[PDB]
């Protein structure tokens, strides 16, 4: 009964992964991604590390 | 001898003004004019009264 019997892996044996049920998942990123919006200035003459 | 006799003004009577002699005159303007030089920045995004 102590053995390593080999179930053969056929094109039929693997099922799709079961994803959990529940309320829909929430955004948990630090900052916004696709929703993010930016106020932009063109700063030409001053190049290099400034003051944020 | 008390009269207002009229010396007539002819094309011949007026001489060129005599300009004084001496060492050459010096610049006495507050700031430089044609000799002046400027360090320039393009400041687009910030319009209106800033800090000099």
Short mmCIF file of N, CA, C and O in Angstrom, two decimals:
data_model
loop_
_atom_site.label_atom_id
_atom_site.label_comp_id
_atom_site.label_asym_id
_atom_site.label_seq_id
_atom_site.Cartn_x
_atom_site.Cartn_y
_atom_site.Cartn_z
N UNK A 1 0.87 -1.21 0.00
CA UNK A 1 0.00 0.00 0.00
C UNK A 1 0.90 1.25 0.00
O UNK A 1 0.41 2.32 -0.40
N UNK A 2 2.15 1.11 0.44
CA UNK A 2 3.22 2.15 0.30
C UNK A 2 3.82 2.03 -1.11
O UNK A 2 4.71 1.18 -1.29
N UNK A 3 3.34 2.86 -2.04
CA UNK A 3 3.74 2.84 -3.48
C UNK A 3 3.63 4.26 -4.06
O UNK A 3 3.13 5.15 -3.36
N UNK A 4 4.07 4.43 -5.31
CA UNK A 4 4.01 5.70 -6.07
C UNK A 4 3.34 5.43 -7.43
O UNK A 4 3.95 5.74 -8.47
N UNK A 5 2.14 4.84 -7.41
CA UNK A 5 1.39 4.46 -8.64
C UNK A 5 1.18 5.73 -9.48
O UNK A 5 0.90 6.78 -8.88
N UNK A 6 1.31 5.61 -10.80
CA UNK A 6 1.34 6.75 -11.77
C UNK A 6 -0.01 6.86 -12.50
O UNK A 6 -0.19 6.16 -13.51
N UNK A 7 -0.92 7.70 -12.00
CA UNK A 7 -2.11 8.17 -12.76
C UNK A 7 -1.58 8.86 -14.02
O UNK A 7 -0.81 9.81 -13.92
N UNK A 8 -1.92 8.38 -15.23
CA UNK A 8 -1.43 9.00 -16.46
C UNK A 8 -2.22 10.29 -16.75
O UNK A 8 -3.42 10.28 -16.59
N UNK A 9 -1.52 11.36 -17.12
CA UNK A 9 -2.10 12.69 -17.44
C UNK A 9 -2.53 12.69 -18.92
O UNK A 9 -1.65 12.73 -19.80
N UNK A 10 -3.84 12.62 -19.16
CA UNK A 10 -4.44 12.64 -20.52
C UNK A 10 -5.00 14.03 -20.80
O UNK A 10 -5.11 14.81 -19.85
N UNK A 11 -5.35 14.31 -22.06
CA UNK A 11 -5.97 15.59 -22.50
C UNK A 11 -7.35 15.76 -21.84
O UNK A 11 -7.93 16.85 -21.98
N UNK A 12 -7.82 14.73 -21.13
CA UNK A 12 -9.17 14.69 -20.49
C UNK A 12 -9.07 14.94 -18.98
O UNK A 12 -10.08 15.42 -18.42
N UNK A 13 -7.93 14.65 -18.34
CA UNK A 13 -7.77 14.57 -16.85
C UNK A 13 -7.80 15.95 -16.19
O UNK A 13 -8.34 16.07 -15.09
N UNK A 14 -7.23 17.03 -16.77
CA UNK A 14 -7.16 18.32 -16.09
C UNK A 14 -8.44 19.17 -16.22
O UNK A 14 -8.85 19.43 -17.34
N UNK A 15 -9.01 19.59 -15.10
CA UNK A 15 -10.24 20.44 -15.05
C UNK A 15 -9.83 21.90 -14.91
O UNK A 15 -8.73 22.20 -14.44
N UNK A 16 -10.70 22.86 -15.30
CA UNK A 16 -10.45 24.28 -15.01
C UNK A 16 -10.39 24.54 -13.49
O UNK A 16 -11.18 23.95 -12.77
N UNK A 17 -9.45 25.40 -13.07
CA UNK A 17 -9.29 25.87 -11.67
C UNK A 17 -10.62 26.48 -11.20
O UNK A 17 -11.25 27.17 -12.02
N UNK A 18 -11.02 26.23 -9.96
CA UNK A 18 -12.26 26.79 -9.36
C UNK A 18 -11.90 28.10 -8.64
O UNK A 18 -11.14 28.03 -7.65
N UNK A 19 -12.41 29.23 -9.14
CA UNK A 19 -12.24 30.59 -8.55
C UNK A 19 -13.32 30.82 -7.50
O UNK A 19 -14.48 30.49 -7.73
N UNK A 20 -13.00 31.42 -6.34
CA UNK A 20 -13.95 31.54 -5.23
C UNK A 20 -15.17 32.42 -5.54
O UNK A 20 -15.06 33.28 -6.40
N UNK A 21 -16.28 32.19 -4.84
CA UNK A 21 -17.52 33.00 -4.88
C UNK A 21 -17.54 33.96 -3.68
O UNK A 21 -16.94 33.62 -2.64
N UNK A 22 -18.22 35.10 -3.83
CA UNK A 22 -18.29 36.17 -2.81
C UNK A 22 -18.50 37.53 -3.46
O UNK A 22 -18.64 37.63 -4.68
N UNK A 23 -18.54 38.62 -2.67
CA UNK A 23 -18.72 39.96 -3.22
C UNK A 23 -17.51 40.33 -4.07
O UNK A 23 -16.43 39.77 -3.87
N UNK A 24 -17.63 41.26 -5.04
CA UNK A 24 -16.53 41.55 -5.97
C UNK A 24 -15.31 42.17 -5.26
O UNK A 24 -15.50 42.93 -4.33
N UNK A 25 -14.10 41.82 -5.73
CA UNK A 25 -12.80 42.25 -5.15
C UNK A 25 -12.61 43.76 -5.30
O UNK A 25 -13.20 44.33 -6.24
N UNK A 26 -11.82 44.37 -4.42
CA UNK A 26 -11.60 45.84 -4.33
C UNK A 26 -10.17 46.20 -4.76
O UNK A 26 -9.28 45.34 -4.64
N UNK A 27 -9.98 47.44 -5.22
CA UNK A 27 -8.65 48.02 -5.54
C UNK A 27 -7.85 48.16 -4.24
O UNK A 27 -8.39 48.74 -3.28
N UNK A 28 -6.62 47.63 -4.23
CA UNK A 28 -5.73 47.63 -3.04
C UNK A 28 -4.35 48.18 -3.41
O UNK A 28 -3.44 48.02 -2.58
N UNK A 29 -4.20 48.82 -4.57
CA UNK A 29 -2.94 49.49 -4.99
C UNK A 29 -2.78 50.79 -4.19
O UNK A 29 -3.82 51.36 -3.81
N UNK A 30 -1.53 51.21 -3.94
CA UNK A 30 -1.18 52.41 -3.13
C UNK A 30 -1.80 53.66 -3.76
O UNK A 30 -2.47 54.43 -3.04
N UNK A 31 -1.55 53.83 -5.06
CA UNK A 31 -2.00 54.97 -5.89
C UNK A 31 -2.89 54.45 -7.02
O UNK A 31 -2.79 53.26 -7.36
N UNK A 32 -3.73 55.34 -7.57
CA UNK A 32 -4.62 55.04 -8.72
C UNK A 32 -3.76 54.63 -9.92
O UNK A 32 -2.61 55.10 -10.00
N UNK A 33 -4.30 53.80 -10.81
CA UNK A 33 -3.58 53.35 -12.03
C UNK A 33 -4.23 53.97 -13.28
O UNK A 33 -3.77 55.05 -13.68
N UNK A 34 -5.27 53.34 -13.85
CA UNK A 34 -5.90 53.82 -15.11
C UNK A 34 -6.82 55.01 -14.82
O UNK A 34 -7.08 55.79 -15.75
N UNK A 35 -7.30 55.14 -13.58
CA UNK A 35 -8.28 56.18 -13.15
C UNK A 35 -7.53 57.47 -12.81
O UNK A 35 -8.16 58.55 -12.86
N UNK A 36 -6.23 57.38 -12.49
CA UNK A 36 -5.38 58.51 -12.05
C UNK A 36 -5.54 59.68 -13.02
O UNK A 36 -5.77 59.43 -14.22
N UNK A 37 -5.44 60.91 -12.51
CA UNK A 37 -5.47 62.16 -13.31
C UNK A 37 -4.36 63.07 -12.81
O UNK A 37 -4.05 63.01 -11.60
N UNK A 38 -3.79 63.90 -13.69
CA UNK A 38 -2.57 64.69 -13.41
C UNK A 38 -2.77 66.13 -13.90
O UNK A 38 -3.31 66.30 -15.01
N UNK A 39 -2.36 67.10 -13.09
CA UNK A 39 -2.18 68.52 -13.49
C UNK A 39 -0.73 68.71 -13.91
O UNK A 39 0.16 68.46 -13.08
N UNK A 40 -0.51 69.11 -15.17
CA UNK A 40 0.82 69.13 -15.83
C UNK A 40 1.27 70.58 -16.07
O UNK A 40 0.42 71.42 -16.40
N UNK A 41 2.57 70.83 -15.88
CA UNK A 41 3.26 72.08 -16.31
C UNK A 41 4.42 71.68 -17.23
O UNK A 41 5.03 70.62 -16.99
N UNK A 42 4.70 72.50 -18.25
CA UNK A 42 5.93 72.41 -19.08
C UNK A 42 7.01 73.25 -18.41
O UNK A 42 6.82 74.47 -18.31
N UNK A 43 8.08 72.60 -17.95
CA UNK A 43 9.19 73.24 -17.19
C UNK A 43 10.48 73.05 -17.99
O UNK A 43 11.24 72.12 -17.74
N UNK A 44 10.77 73.93 -18.97
CA UNK A 44 11.89 73.73 -19.89
C UNK A 44 13.24 74.21 -19.32
O UNK A 44 14.12 73.38 -19.18
N UNK A 45 13.37 75.51 -19.01
CA UNK A 45 14.66 76.19 -18.70
C UNK A 45 15.32 75.54 -17.48
O UNK A 45 16.51 75.16 -17.59
N UNK A 46 14.59 75.40 -16.37
CA UNK A 46 15.02 74.61 -15.18
C UNK A 46 15.00 73.13 -15.54
O UNK A 46 13.90 72.55 -15.65
N UNK A 47 16.19 72.55 -15.74
CA UNK A 47 16.41 71.09 -15.87
C UNK A 47 16.96 70.59 -14.52
O UNK A 47 17.42 71.44 -13.73
N UNK A 48 16.86 69.29 -14.26
CA UNK A 48 17.49 68.63 -13.09
C UNK A 48 16.68 68.78 -11.82
O UNK A 48 15.71 69.57 -11.82
N UNK A 49 17.09 68.06 -10.77
CA UNK A 49 16.36 67.92 -9.47
C UNK A 49 16.01 69.31 -8.91
O UNK A 49 16.96 70.09 -8.64
N UNK A 50 14.71 69.59 -8.76
CA UNK A 50 14.17 70.87 -8.27
C UNK A 50 13.65 70.76 -6.85
O UNK A 50 14.32 70.12 -6.02
N UNK A 51 12.49 71.38 -6.59
CA UNK A 51 11.73 71.27 -5.30
C UNK A 51 10.32 70.77 -5.63
O UNK A 51 9.60 71.41 -6.39
N UNK A 52 9.88 69.63 -5.05
CA UNK A 52 8.58 69.06 -5.39
C UNK A 52 7.41 69.93 -4.92
O UNK A 52 6.47 70.06 -5.68
N UNK B 1 20.90 156.22 -32.21
CA UNK B 1 21.73 155.02 -31.94
C UNK B 1 20.85 153.97 -31.23
O UNK B 1 21.21 152.78 -31.27
N UNK B 2 19.75 154.41 -30.61
CA UNK B 2 18.67 153.52 -30.08
C UNK B 2 17.73 153.17 -31.23
O UNK B 2 16.83 153.98 -31.52
N UNK B 3 17.93 152.01 -31.85
CA UNK B 3 17.18 151.55 -33.05
C UNK B 3 17.09 150.02 -33.03
O UNK B 3 17.70 149.39 -32.15
N UNK B 4 16.35 149.45 -33.99
CA UNK B 4 16.21 147.99 -34.21
C UNK B 4 16.53 147.68 -35.67
O UNK B 4 15.69 147.07 -36.36
N UNK B 5 17.72 148.09 -36.12
CA UNK B 5 18.19 147.86 -37.51
C UNK B 5 18.18 146.35 -37.77
O UNK B 5 18.55 145.60 -36.85
N UNK B 6 17.75 145.95 -38.97
CA UNK B 6 17.51 144.53 -39.37
C UNK B 6 18.67 144.06 -40.25
O UNK B 6 18.63 144.30 -41.47
N UNK B 7 19.68 143.41 -39.65
CA UNK B 7 20.67 142.58 -40.39
C UNK B 7 19.88 141.51 -41.13
O UNK B 7 19.15 140.74 -40.51
N UNK B 8 19.93 141.46 -42.48
CA UNK B 8 19.17 140.46 -43.24
C UNK B 8 19.87 139.10 -43.16
O UNK B 8 21.08 139.07 -43.28
N UNK B 9 19.11 138.03 -42.92
CA UNK B 9 19.60 136.64 -42.82
C UNK B 9 19.66 136.04 -44.23
O UNK B 9 18.60 135.76 -44.83
N UNK B 10 20.88 135.90 -44.75
CA UNK B 10 21.16 135.35 -46.10
C UNK B 10 21.61 133.90 -45.95
O UNK B 10 21.94 133.50 -44.82
N UNK B 11 21.66 133.17 -47.07
CA UNK B 11 22.16 131.77 -47.19
C UNK B 11 23.62 131.70 -46.74
O UNK B 11 24.12 130.58 -46.56
N UNK B 12 24.28 132.85 -46.57
CA UNK B 12 25.74 132.99 -46.30
C UNK B 12 25.99 133.35 -44.83
O UNK B 12 27.10 133.03 -44.35
N UNK B 13 25.03 133.97 -44.13
CA UNK B 13 25.23 134.62 -42.80
C UNK B 13 25.40 133.61 -41.66
O UNK B 13 26.17 133.89 -40.74
N UNK B 14 24.73 132.43 -41.64
CA UNK B 14 24.82 131.52 -40.50
C UNK B 14 26.05 130.61 -40.53
O UNK B 14 26.23 129.91 -41.51
N UNK B 15 26.86 130.63 -39.47
CA UNK B 15 28.07 129.78 -39.33
C UNK B 15 27.70 128.52 -38.54
O UNK B 15 26.74 128.53 -37.78
N UNK B 16 28.45 127.41 -38.69
CA UNK B 16 28.27 126.25 -37.82
C UNK B 16 28.55 126.60 -36.35
O UNK B 16 29.48 127.34 -36.09
N UNK B 17 27.72 126.06 -35.44
CA UNK B 17 27.88 126.17 -33.97
C UNK B 17 29.28 125.67 -33.60
O UNK B 17 29.72 124.66 -34.19
N UNK B 18 29.95 126.35 -32.66
CA UNK B 18 31.29 125.95 -32.15
C UNK B 18 31.08 125.07 -30.91
O UNK B 18 30.59 125.58 -29.89
N UNK B 19 31.44 123.78 -31.04
CA UNK B 19 31.37 122.76 -29.95
C UNK B 19 32.67 122.83 -29.15
O UNK B 19 33.75 122.93 -29.73
N UNK B 20 32.61 122.72 -27.81
CA UNK B 20 33.79 122.92 -26.96
C UNK B 20 34.89 121.87 -27.19
O UNK B 20 34.59 120.78 -27.64
N UNK B 21 36.14 122.24 -26.88
CA UNK B 21 37.32 121.33 -26.87
C UNK B 21 37.62 120.93 -25.42
O UNK B 21 37.27 121.68 -24.49
N UNK B 22 38.26 119.77 -25.28
CA UNK B 22 38.53 119.12 -23.98
C UNK B 22 38.62 117.61 -24.15
O UNK B 22 38.49 117.09 -25.25
N UNK B 23 38.84 116.86 -23.05
CA UNK B 23 38.92 115.40 -23.14
C UNK B 23 37.55 114.86 -23.51
O UNK B 23 36.55 115.53 -23.29
N UNK B 24 37.45 113.64 -24.11
CA UNK B 24 36.17 113.14 -24.60
C UNK B 24 35.16 112.89 -23.48
O UNK B 24 35.57 112.47 -22.41
N UNK B 25 33.88 113.15 -23.76
CA UNK B 25 32.74 113.04 -22.80
C UNK B 25 32.54 111.58 -22.39
O UNK B 25 32.90 110.68 -23.18
N UNK B 26 31.98 111.36 -21.19
CA UNK B 26 31.81 110.03 -20.55
C UNK B 26 30.33 109.64 -20.49
O UNK B 26 29.47 110.54 -20.48
N UNK B 27 30.05 108.34 -20.43
CA UNK B 27 28.69 107.77 -20.23
C UNK B 27 28.21 108.13 -18.82
O UNK B 27 28.97 107.86 -17.86
N UNK B 28 27.01 108.71 -18.72
CA UNK B 28 26.40 109.13 -17.43
C UNK B 28 24.97 108.59 -17.32
O UNK B 28 24.23 109.10 -16.47
N UNK B 29 24.60 107.58 -18.11
CA UNK B 29 23.29 106.88 -18.00
C UNK B 29 23.34 105.96 -16.78
O UNK B 29 24.45 105.50 -16.44
N UNK B 30 22.18 105.73 -16.14
CA UNK B 30 22.05 104.91 -14.89
C UNK B 30 22.52 103.48 -15.16
O UNK B 30 23.35 102.96 -14.38
N UNK B 31 21.98 102.89 -16.22
CA UNK B 31 22.25 101.50 -16.66
C UNK B 31 22.85 101.53 -18.07
O UNK B 31 22.66 102.54 -18.78
N UNK B 32 23.54 100.46 -18.45
CA UNK B 32 24.14 100.28 -19.80
C UNK B 32 23.03 100.31 -20.84
O UNK B 32 21.89 99.93 -20.50
N UNK B 33 23.34 100.75 -22.06
CA UNK B 33 22.36 100.83 -23.17
C UNK B 33 22.72 99.79 -24.24
O UNK B 33 22.19 98.66 -24.15
N UNK B 34 23.59 100.11 -25.20
CA UNK B 34 23.93 99.19 -26.33
C UNK B 34 24.91 98.12 -25.85
O UNK B 34 24.96 97.05 -26.48
N UNK B 35 25.66 98.39 -24.78
CA UNK B 35 26.73 97.50 -24.25
C UNK B 35 26.09 96.45 -23.33
O UNK B 35 26.72 95.39 -23.15
N UNK B 36 24.90 96.73 -22.79
CA UNK B 36 24.18 95.87 -21.83
C UNK B 36 24.14 94.42 -22.34
O UNK B 36 24.12 94.22 -23.56
N UNK B 37 24.18 93.46 -21.42
CA UNK B 37 24.06 92.01 -21.72
C UNK B 37 23.10 91.40 -20.71
O UNK B 37 23.08 91.89 -19.56
N UNK B 38 22.36 90.37 -21.11
CA UNK B 38 21.26 89.79 -20.31
C UNK B 38 21.36 88.26 -20.32
O UNK B 38 21.65 87.69 -21.40
N UNK B 39 21.17 87.65 -19.15
CA UNK B 39 20.94 86.19 -18.98
C UNK B 39 19.43 85.97 -18.98
O UNK B 39 18.75 86.55 -18.12
N UNK B 40 18.93 85.17 -19.93
CA UNK B 40 17.48 85.02 -20.22
C UNK B 40 17.02 83.61 -19.85
O UNK B 40 17.79 82.66 -20.06
N UNK B 41 15.80 83.51 -19.32
CA UNK B 41 15.04 82.23 -19.14
C UNK B 41 13.70 82.38 -19.86
O UNK B 41 13.16 83.50 -19.88
N UNK B 42 13.20 81.29 -20.45
CA UNK B 42 11.82 81.18 -21.00
C UNK B 42 10.92 80.71 -19.85
O UNK B 42 11.14 79.59 -19.36
N UNK B 43 9.97 81.55 -19.43
CA UNK B 43 9.06 81.29 -18.28
C UNK B 43 7.62 81.26 -18.80
O UNK B 43 6.92 82.27 -18.73
N UNK B 44 7.15 80.12 -19.35
CA UNK B 44 5.86 80.08 -20.03
C UNK B 44 4.66 79.88 -19.08
O UNK B 44 3.82 80.76 -19.03
N UNK B 45 4.63 78.76 -18.35
CA UNK B 45 3.47 78.28 -17.56
C UNK B 45 3.09 79.32 -16.50
O UNK B 45 1.90 79.70 -16.46
N UNK B 46 4.04 79.78 -15.68
CA UNK B 46 3.85 80.93 -14.75
C UNK B 46 3.75 82.22 -15.57
O UNK B 46 4.79 82.67 -16.10
N UNK B 47 2.54 82.76 -15.69
CA UNK B 47 2.28 84.11 -16.22
C UNK B 47 2.03 85.04 -15.03
O UNK B 47 1.77 84.52 -13.93
N UNK B 48 2.16 86.36 -15.23
CA UNK B 48 1.79 87.39 -14.24
C UNK B 48 2.86 87.62 -13.19
O UNK B 48 3.82 86.82 -13.15
N UNK B 49 2.69 88.66 -12.36
CA UNK B 49 3.68 89.16 -11.38
C UNK B 49 4.18 88.00 -10.50
O UNK B 49 3.35 87.42 -9.77
N UNK B 50 5.48 87.71 -10.56
CA UNK B 50 6.15 86.65 -9.78
C UNK B 50 7.01 87.25 -8.68
O UNK B 50 6.53 88.19 -8.00
N UNK B 51 8.22 86.71 -8.48
CA UNK B 51 9.26 87.24 -7.54
C UNK B 51 10.54 87.50 -8.33
O UNK B 51 11.08 86.58 -8.94
N UNK B 52 11.07 88.74 -8.32
CA UNK B 52 12.25 89.07 -9.12
C UNK B 52 13.52 88.35 -8.64
O UNK B 52 14.27 87.91 -9.48
#
